[PDB]
């Protein structure tokens, strides 16, 4: 990898983890001193970081960490509902029986840690590389910094496991229509859970 | 912008336009001489270009322009159906009456040029910035290099205008469910039109 890519993921991880507070003023000088890179590759990283809605550009000031507002949550979970739901539909037709059985194995294994492995197996089982990039590469970063800033309720881990199993049941039955619907409801339950603390 | 961003869009435009043939071996030396940049920022551009499925990485060789195969078309138009269809649903509830009337004005205005403005107004009318980036910033680049490599049939421009107007009619009636369905059918008609020459 190049240095421009190194400082990218180091800053991106500091934003998703809350290390840099949502809404902070990003100081390009003190950041170039923390990692020791010139302003060329640094501005290259901020531009990408603004593209993924992690940083936001202010005209007369500079870059700022995203507001982490309610409108941005609607924007994010909307796309995630349409994409993950379709991932369940495609995974139900395209997953081999070996991938399905391994999916139940992963689910049988079980702030909050979460079950990203469950969703990741389905997105991969959908057989769409572009879908995997848009979900796990772009959307899931802004998703995580919401779940990190706002912890779930103590009954949410139990509720999501039930939702996960019924989704798996529809996928294992080759019922993409039901799996897509069950996936959508589970995404909407996740958004309402986060909307409980704003 | 930085130089790393300049050579990015210059190569990306040379791929979408067919200037660089689909499936060609990208020569990092002769490319670094064409634009005059070091291998650091050059490798930075190829990495992003591979992310958007424009270049593909070969282990023991290097980077190659995407195969432009049939499987990649299915991968691409799948995501476009789910995203653009949802864009029509959201645009039907969220577009102001001024944006709708202006949408009919744009449609009333009318290889092939295409009606990207029509789709762009709807994606913007959806009120989702992430949706606009994923559609117009990532997917629509790989879309264009398919429509450039494979020209439509002479009756396709006429057929798409009818599809566009019925979509506009459902949006102007605040019928997101019908607009989404009509949008999906029009996306599927576009894919079959391209599938006619492979
Ligand atoms: C636990 C979870 O199901 C997950 O898969 O990580 C969560 C649910 C939630 O946060 O309410 C998710 O999918 O976002
Ligand atoms: C003409 C078109 O409707 C367009 O909006 O550019 C095309 C249709 C097609 O290519 O068959 C499109 O949307 O892809
Ligand atoms: Zn979950
Ligand atoms: Zn069209």
Report the C-alpha gap between A145 and B121 in whole angstroms.
30
Residue closest by Cα to atom 12 of ligand 2: B190
Report the C-alpha gap between A130 and B139 in whole angstroms.
9
Is the separation of the CB atoms in B129 and A53 below 8 Å? yes
Q: Between B156-172 and B97-108, two packed helices, what is the crossing angle to 10 degrees? A: 160
Is the separation of the CB atoms in A149 and A68 below 8 Å? yes
Reduced 3-state DSSP string for chain A = CCHHHHHHHHHHHHHHCCCCCCCCECCHHHHHHHHCCCHHHHHHHHHHHHHCCCEEECCCCCEEECCCCHHHHHHHHHHHHHHHHHHHHHHHHHCCHHHHHHHHHHHHCCCCCCCHHHHHHHHHHCCCHHHHHHHHHHHHHHHHHHHHHCCCCCCHHHHHHHHHHHHHHHHHCCCHHHHHHHHHHHHHHHHHHHHCCC
Short-list B171, B188, B198, B193, CA closest to B82: B188
Contact A83 B78 (CB under 8 A): no
Q: Which residue has the tokens 């409108």?
A: A71
First to last CA, chain B: 38
**CA A119–ligand 3 middle distance (angstroms):** 6
Report the C-alpha gap between B97 and B95 in whole angstroms.
6
Q: Which residue from A4, A76, A130 is facing B75, i.e. has the nearest CB? A: A130
Reduced 3-state DSSP string for chain B = CCHHHHHHHHHHHHHHCCCCCCCCECCHHHHHHHHCCCHHHHHHHHHHHHHCCCEEECCCCCEEECCCCHHHHHHHHHHHHHHHHHHHHHHHHHCCHHHHHHHHHHHHCCCCCCCHHHHHHHHHHCCCHHHHHHHHHHHHHHHHHHHHHCCCCCCHHHHHHHHHHHHHHHHHCCCHHHHHHHHHHHHHHHHHHHHCCC
Report the C-alpha gap between A75 and B44 in whole angstroms.
29
Report the C-alpha gap between A100 and B111 in whole angstroms.
44
B44's CB contacts (< 8 A; 6+ apart) are A2, A4, A5, A44, B4
What the block records as the tokens of A69 is 């507002």
Short-list B38, B45, B43, B39, CA closest to B7: B45
Q: How far is B128 from chain A (nearest CA, A)?
A: 6
The full length of chain A comes to: 198
Is the separation of the CB atoms in A67 and A74 below 8 Å? no
Chain B residue numbers with beta carbons less than 8 Å from the beta carbon of A53 are 129-130, 133
Q: Is B18 exposed, middle or buried (0-12, 13-18, 19+ CB in 10 A)?
A: middle
Residue closest by Cα to atom 8 of ligand 1: A190
What the block records as the tokens of B100 is 């709708």
Residue closest by Cα to atom 2 of ligand 1: A114
Report the C-alpha gap between B33 and B97 in whole angstroms.
52
Give ∠ CA B6-A65-B135 in degrees, rounded to 5.
55
CB neighbours (10 Å) of residue A162?
10
Short-list A154, A145, A191, A188, CA closest to A12: A145
First to last CA, chain A: 38
CB neighbours (10 Å) of residue A131?
21
Q: Which residue has the tokens 């019928």?
A: B175
Report the C-alpha gap between B72 and B74 in whole angstroms.
5
Which atom number of ligand 1 is nearest to the Cα of residue A156?
A: 11
Contact B2 A83 (CB under 8 A): no
Is the separation of the CB atoms in A140 and A53 below 8 Å? no
Q: Between B156-172 and B176-195, two packed helices, what is the crossing angle to 10 degrees? A: 170
**Phi/psi zone of residue A25: left (φ > 0), alpha (ψ -120 to 50 degrees), beta?**
beta
CB neighbours (10 Å) of residue B114?
16
B155 and A CB contact within 8 Å: no
Ligand 2: lining residues by beta carbon, under 6 Å? B 114-116, 118-119, 147, 152, 156, 160, 190, 193
Contact B134 A79 (CB under 8 A): yes
Which atom number of ligand 2 is nearest to the Cα of residue B147?
A: 10
Report the C-alpha gap between B198 and B195 in whole angstroms.
6
Chain A residue numbers with beta carbons less than 8 Å from the beta carbon of B43 are 2
A90 and B CB contact within 8 Å: yes
Short-list A82, A60, A129, A52, CA closest to B71: A129
Residue closest by Cα to atom 10 of ligand 1: A190
The full length of chain B comes to: 198
Backbone angles phi, psi at A107, to 5 degrees: -70, -35
Report the C-alpha gap between B70 and B167 in whole angstroms.
27
What the block records as the tokens of A84 is 């993950």
- Beta-bridge partners for B197: none
Is the separation of the CB atoms in A179 and A93 below 8 Å? no
Chain B residue numbers with beta carbons less than 8 Å from the beta carbon of A4 are 4, 40-41, 44
Report the C-alpha gap between B20 and B65 in whole angstroms.
8
Q: Annotated binding site: which residue ranges of B?
A: 115, 119, 164, 186
Q: Which residue from A1, A82, A128 is facing B75, i.e. has the nearest CB? A: A128
Q: Which residue has the tokens 């269809």?
A: B85
Q: Which residue has the tokens 């605040």?
A: B174
Is the separation of the CB atoms in B93 and B176 below 8 Å? yes
What the block records as the tokens of B172 is 């102007």
Is the separation of the CB atoms in B190 and B76 below 8 Å? no
Backbone angles phi, psi at A59, to 5 degrees: -55, -60
Integer angstrom CA distances of residue A9 from A15, A46, A52, A141, A147: 10, 11, 12, 11, 19
What the block records as the tokens of B115 is 């009606």
What the block records as the tokens of A10 is 């180091």
Chain B residue numbers with beta carbons less than 8 Å from the beta carbon of A43 are 2
By CA distance, what is B139's nearest residue in A? A130
Output the CA torsion sign for A105, A109, A112, A113: negative
Contact B53 A3 (CB under 8 A): no
Chain centre to alpha carbon of residue B124: 15
Q: Are strands A63-65 and A55-57 parallel, antiparallel or unpaired?
A: antiparallel
So where are chain B's domains? 1-67, 68-198
Resolution in Å, one decimal, please: 2.5
Q: Which residue has the tokens 């979970």?
A: A77
Mutate to test the pocket of ligand 1, among A135, A147, A148 (most ligand atoms within 8 A of CB): A147
B56 and A CB contact within 8 Å: no
């Amino acid at each position: 990898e190049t240095l421009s890519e190194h400082v990218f993921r180091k800053i991106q991880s500091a934003i998703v983890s809350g290390e840099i507070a949502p809404g902070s003023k990003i100081s390009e000088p003190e950041l170039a001193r923390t990692y020791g890179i010139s302003r060329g590759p640094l501005r290259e990283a901020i531009h990408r970081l603004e593209g993924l809605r992690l940083l936001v550009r202010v005209p007369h000031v500079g870059a700022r960490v995203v507001s982490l507002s309610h409108a941005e949550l609607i924007e994010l979970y909307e796309i995630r509902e349409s994409l993950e739901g379709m991932a369940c539909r495609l995974a139900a037709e395209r997953m081999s029986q070996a991938e399905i059985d391994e999916l139940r194995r992963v689910l049988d294994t079980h702030q909050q840690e979460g079950d990203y492995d469950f969703h990741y197996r389905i997105i991969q089982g959908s057989g769409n590389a572009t879908l995997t990039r848009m979900l796990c590469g772009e959307l899931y970063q802004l998703v995580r910094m919401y779940r990190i800033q706002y912890s779930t309720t103590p009954n949410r881990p139990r509720q999501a496991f039930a939702e996960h199993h019924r989704i798996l049941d529809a996928i294992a039955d080759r019922d993409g229509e039901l799996a897509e619907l069950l996936m959508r409801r589970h995404i909407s339950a996740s958004r309402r859970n986060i909307e409980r603390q704003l």
